[PDB]
Amino acid sequence: KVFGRCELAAAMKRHGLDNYRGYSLGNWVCAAKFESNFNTQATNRNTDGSTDYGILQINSRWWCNDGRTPGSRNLCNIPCSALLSSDITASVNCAKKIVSDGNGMNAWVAWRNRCKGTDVQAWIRGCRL
Ligand SMILES: [Cl-]
Ligand SMILES: [Cl-]
Ligand SMILES: [Cl-]
Ligand SMILES: [Cl-]
Ligand SMILES: [Cl-]
Ligand SMILES: [Cl-]
Ligand SMILES: [Cl-]
Ligand SMILES: [Cl-]
Ligand SMILES: [Cl-]
Ligand SMILES: [Cl-]
Ligand code: NA
């Protein structure tokens, strides 16, 4: 599913991501924009042989099982395919664990490089919330 911007903002809020660990909703929408362009089916292979999955590009090195990432963990206790669903529940629940792991949203390199310190409220402007 390719979400609309305000549609995703609303879905993230319903799932408790707004202000989670202190990160406003616009931070999460901005991260999803640059990670996946709001496409739940996005996948990308990493240099190390892990793969990133879904709207927030969650990585099989630590967070999900894809059967092909040697030595990896599955800390969200999910198949990586769950992160590709039109329903964002699994991605949101796993993102909550990731952002709690110590480095906040810096876990998403694209958030650090493209969202952090910017006017992230622009990403939710106009949306009914
Ligand atoms: Cl599509
Ligand atoms: Cl929308
Ligand atoms: Cl957009
Ligand atoms: Cl915001
Ligand atoms: Cl594996
Ligand atoms: Cl594990
Ligand atoms: Cl699995
Ligand atoms: Cl959803
Ligand atoms: Cl933080
Ligand atoms: Cl990353
Ligand atoms: Na894994």
Instruction: Look up 52 and say whether it is catalytic.
Output: yes
Cα atoms in the Cβ-side hemisphere of radius 13 Å centred on 35? 30
CB burial string 110-127: b at 16+ within 10 A, e below? bbeeebbeeebeebbeeb
Give CA torsion, residues 3, 20, 103, 77, to 10 deg. Answer: -70
Burial status of residue 43 (CB atoms within 10 A of its CB: 0-12, 13-18, 19 or more):
middle
Distance from Cα 79 to the centre of ligand 6, integer Å: 11
Query: CB–CB of 37/66 below 8 Å?
Result: no
**Max CA-CA distance within the chain?**
44
Q: Which two tokens stand for residue 95?
A: 């993102």
Instruction: Look up 18 and say whether it is catalytic.
Output: no
- Give all domains of the chain, ordered by start, each with its CATH number: 1-129 (1.10.530.10)
Distance from Cα 28 to the centre of ligand 10, integer Å: 14
Distance CA 124, CA 122 (A): 5
Ligand sitting nearest the alpha carbon of 51: 11
Q: Which element (helix H / strand E) includes 112?
A: helix 109-114
**Which residues make beta-bridge pairs with 58?**
53
Distance CA 3, CA 119 (A): 21
* Helical packing angle, 25-36 and 5-14, nearest 10°: 130
Length of the chain: 129
Distance from Cα 22 to the centre of ligand 9, integer Å: 7
Please indicate the experimental technique that yielded this structure. X-ray
Positions at the binding site for substrate: 101
**Which residues make beta-bridge pairs with 52?**
44, 59
